[PDB]
């Protein structure tokens, strides 16, 4: 159960750079690939997968041989620890040896779309709660988000844009709650929108920002428990437009603020005792939801589905080959590739994605190496994942 906000109650930011008021933008990072290995002729599911970015605001479109594809499918969109967004696009496709398949990418951050080709060669648990606030001045009220996770699994969502908004379930076995408590969760997130109403309108003022202007506020707030019931660590941490604001110290009774309007914010509520509510709500109210929630998902919420992998062969210029150790499949998304010479991990040469959805609840990510021809025998590719009775050890099989 997420925390009732108290209003920031910022003070003028004299901004004269990096504060959370008028954000510094970030690019969206892309990755268009497959769900499943992809065969001429066979249904299939290409994704385009966007992190990184911030505004939240994005437009994407999949194109084949150039023409936008109709329906494409978008996940519900989510934001990182780093207060980075991130989306997941889809769409149904049936792949031949020579249509051209893209996602197009427009974004704040960037002067022009950005084109990205498919290209196909071959013990310790958490509560926390991922809130969102963006005002959205000619397209309607500001949008309001309250995002429950459980060991980094979704769990509960609320979004404002709605007739009738209310929480509700993302995890089937979050369906043991009872109908009071998505009233009282629904009820309290309706009266947490209201207070970040109120904030995004101050924190124009105090940033000296255009009402004209689509603004975000974000929050991290939770706790960290461990394996014998005891908090760890406990969360409170709030960010304008992408950018540090202020956040509760891992002693629950200090606040560091980051730019000249959150030092206002952190006097009124050091005056007002906002830690010490704070620490209650951290050692206990969260603590208690956690363990109740823990118990609800128990067995889901510590299942594993080990990667299967497997080396591919692509040429070169001239004497060289491109080795590809592939994991696939795999859950959690915790995992780690790497290609040994003779004993010794290489760094030079590897080349990695970041580890991407398939779409279907489950992992993928792929290293490579660059090669000589003829010694492919020499290298052997290495994957590490918690769902694996042993490391796999495996190598280019002609």
Request: negative net charge; contains cysteine.
């Amino acid at each position: 159960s997420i925390i009732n906000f108290e209003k920031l109650g910022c003070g003028a930011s004299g901004g004269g750079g990096s504060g959370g008021g008028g954000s510094i933008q970030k690019t969206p990072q892309i990755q268009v690939y497959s769900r499943h290995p992809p065969e001429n002729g066979k249904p299939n599911i290409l994704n385009c997968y966007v992190t990184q970015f911030h505004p939240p605001h994005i437009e994407i479109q999949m194109l084949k041989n150039g023409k936008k594809i109709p329906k494409v499918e978008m996940s519900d969109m989510s934001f990182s620890k780093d207060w980075s967004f991130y989306i997941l696009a889809h769409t149904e496709f049936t792949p031949t040896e020579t249509d051209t398949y893209a996602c197009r990418v427009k974004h704040a951050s960037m002067a022009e779309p950005k084109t990205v080709y498919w290209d196909r060669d071959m013990g310790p648990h958490s509560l926390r709660y991922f809130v969102t606030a963006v005002s959205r001045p000619g397209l309607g009220e500001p949008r309001y988000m309250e995002v429950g996770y459980v060991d980094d699994t979704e769990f509960v969502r609320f979004d404002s844009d709605a007739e009738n908004p209310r929480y509700e379930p993302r995890a089937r076995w979050m369906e043991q709650e009872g109908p009071e408590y998505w009233e009282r969760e629904t009820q309290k997130a309706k009266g947490n929108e209201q207070s970040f109403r109120v904030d995004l309108r101050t924190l124009l003022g105090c940033y000296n920002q255009s009402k004209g202007g689509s603004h975000t506020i974000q929050v991290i707030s939770g706790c960290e428990v461990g394996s014998d019931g005891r908090l760890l660590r406990g969360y409170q941490q709030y960010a304008y437009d992408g950018c540090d604001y202020i956040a509760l110290n891992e002693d629950l009774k200090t606040w560091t603020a980051a730019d000249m309007a959150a030092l206002i914010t952190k006097h009124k509520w050091e005056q007002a005792g906002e830690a010490e509510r704070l620490r209650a709500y951290l050692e206990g109210t969260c603590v208690e939801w956690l363990r109740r929630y823990l118990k609800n998902g128990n067995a889901t919420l510590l299942r594993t589905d080990s990667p299967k992998a497997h080396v591919t062969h692509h040429s070169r210029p001239e004497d060289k080959v491109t080795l590809r150790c592939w994991a696939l499949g795999f859950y959690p998304a915790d995992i780690t590739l790497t290609w040994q010479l003779n004993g010794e991990e290489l760094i030079q040469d590897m080349e990695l994605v970041e580890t991407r959805p398939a779409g279907d609840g489950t992992f993928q990510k792929w290293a490579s190496v660059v090669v000589p021809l003829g010694k492919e025998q020499y290298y052997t590719c290495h994957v590490y994942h918690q769902g694996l009775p042993e490391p796999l050890t495996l190598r280019w099989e002609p």
